[PDB]
Write a protein that binds this ligand. Structure first.
Ligand SMILES: COc1cc(C(=O)O)cc([N+](=O)[O-])c1O
Ligand SMILES: COc1cc(C(=O)O)cc([N+](=O)[O-])c1O
Ligand SMILES: [Cl-]
Ligand SMILES: [Cl-]
Lengths: 349, 349
């Protein structure tokens, strides 16, 4: 079963959640780990990826750092026509020195824009920001859209234990709506306030902690009414929607029960059900979930227009996953939406 | 009038996750709230249910405390033939005074056993323990199985921030294997080490935090190798498996990645995949999830023999949910397993 670029099978493969790193940023993580300012998540996640002697961690690091011929080759070998690229979690979000965070985010964005320019038919950019400074972040969203050819931004969930439902972060949403671009909420390790029981069992990372953190964050945003405030805003999440589609019946039941019993001041009546917001304002990718039953479930819940293919390169670079997706028992029209035309629509490619 | 007991529709309706309270234990929660020894989760959960004048809270309290004709009338009105009853979360697990914990658990168990004796064709008991004292808990498991006629025990997830994968709790598992009975791991609020970001958003309870806490607890039991140490052990969870069936592909992928890379001391090779353990040692109810797509997904993933009906009375007592379950697009044979015969098998009714 051959994996070829060019769309001869009836669609292009557009991979919508693909990571890169910059040497300068990984070096800051290593410095933070050495000087004791790294949070427990950073020590766990980047203490491993930047310091494990294994062939595997080593290959992920090398692949993350390449934005040229090797990445193109890996894409060609798996039949990936286009990749939507974003700076790997947690970006500059954990950094205490804001001059450094803004400088390195600017440089990461510059580097990405240069790579997309060099490979305009293969690489598509999502910008990185420094939510610590929402006003600068808003300017960088405009710069991404205006000068850099970027299609949106990726935020790596929380910023130092603070979440985007806080009014403090509103300039970011204001800017996304001004440029009419989607937000990808990508996972991160939980903050120190929440991580301990997961970390002790080995569950703080992609196995579990990622989905908890990210699902929590998107749920918080839905329930604060972000989509009533910003009805045009689209938020994309990976990993088959961080379980929210499967939890949907219970989410809506318990959300309505809480509101009606006036349990939490924070939880106020919304204009739509959570189901309603999933169908109008949330977009999902299958990153890390090359599994047909889950994909089909999620298509049924959210609509086939709102579920997209993502590989999660280089953390999950598996040719047999692409093969299993190419071979799903799904109509030609639906498969082409999933691999290609959904992404083309929602990222305005 | 259209929901009837007696099984004329082809099956009995056995509700496998039904709650009661004792006044004296609720009073201890109130005391702990007043004296500042309650954890944040108890304050949130029981500060609401024991004190709110809302319709939802008052009905829950009233129904939780009844183990006689009012409960029977509520069951008759919704066609529920039998209910498997357990002391409502968090039971005695948060109590600092062990003598008090052991005493109140004993009394809750004797109270339940009295009710089952009085209505033996309607009420089935799961016992409650005090995992703070694992050895006492082992003896109470003996007593439940051999003297009180109970079919298993329910543990309300964590005990004072500690999880059952610790060797400290091993006497509980030894005892369950000895009497050959299932453990139901029911939710609780997250411990103080994890709860803050959920609590601040109104998400610490059943809407989200419950699933995070219970899924993490089952997952860490699986990854520590509990089912290799005790291959006969069956662990039941509600809420459609706390999303673990939906996450399965990601869980197995990332579990294997973590094992092979030696990332974590508590994540070593297991004899089966996580999927393997779901199909041989884990059992699921649909408590809180009266939703055909999720039920069918779960049946597909774990096997239709391993998925059972639960109402979650009184937290979710909805005649229209029972009607929706009766109307599902399933064979008569599948429906009978789901409502009746799986429970008869797994609880040894
Ligand atoms: C640093 O970012 C990631 C790390 C990993 C991992 O540790 O396996 C997974 C994904 N992911 O999306 O699942 C990441 O993007
Ligand atoms: C204190 O026990 C529970 C509370 C809630 C609730 O607050 O709605 C729901 C369930 N449940 O399992 O969904 C409970 O068992
Ligand atoms: Cl606690
Ligand atoms: Cl292996």
């Amino acid at each position: 079963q051959d994996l070829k670029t060019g769309g001869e099978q009836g669609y292009l493969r557009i991979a919508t959640e693909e990571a890169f790193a910059t040497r300068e940023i990984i070096d800051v993580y290593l410095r933070m780990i050495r000087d004791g300012t790294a949070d427990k998540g950073m020590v766990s996640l980047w203490g491993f990826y930047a310091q494990s002697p294994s062939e595997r961690a080593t290959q992920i690091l090398e692949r993350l750092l390449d934005l040229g011929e090797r990445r193109i080759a890996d894409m060609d070998a798996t039949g990936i026509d286009k990749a939507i690229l974003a700076l790997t979690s947690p970006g500059v979000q954990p950094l205490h020195d804001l001059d450094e965070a803004r400088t390195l985010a600017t440089r990461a964005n510059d580097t990405l824009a240069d790579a997309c320019q060099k490979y305009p038919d293969r690489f598509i950019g999502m910008g990185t920001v420094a939510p610590q400074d929402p006003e600068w972040s808003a300017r960088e969203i405009h710069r991404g859209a205006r000068e850099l050819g970027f299609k949106g931004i990726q935020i790596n969930s929380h910023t130092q234990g603070r979440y985007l439902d806080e009014e403090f972060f509103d300039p970011i949403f204001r800017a996304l709506v001004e440029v009419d671009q989607p937000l990808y909420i990508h996972p991160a390790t939980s903050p120190d306030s929440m991580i301990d029981p997961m970390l002790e069992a080995g569950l703080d990372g992609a196995i579990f902690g990622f989905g908890v953190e990210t699902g929590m964050h998107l749920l918080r945003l839905i329930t604060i009414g972000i989509f009533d405030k910003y009805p045009s805003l689209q938020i994309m999440v990976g990993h088959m929607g961080e379980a929210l589609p499967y939890w949907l019946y219970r989410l809506d039941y318990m959300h309505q029960a809480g509101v009606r019993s006036q349990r939490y001041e924070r939880m106020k009546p919304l204009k739509k059900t959570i189901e309603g917001y999933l169908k109008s304002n949330v977009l999902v990718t299958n990153s890390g979930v090359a599994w047909e039953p889950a994909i089909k479930f999620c298509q049924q819940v959210m609509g086939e227009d709102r579920v997209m293919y993502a590989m999660n390169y280089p953390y999950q670079y598996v040719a047999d996953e692409v093969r299993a997706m190419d071979a799903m028992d799904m109509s030609a029209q639906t498969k082409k939406k999933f691999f290609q035309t959904n992404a083309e629509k929602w990222f305005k490619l």
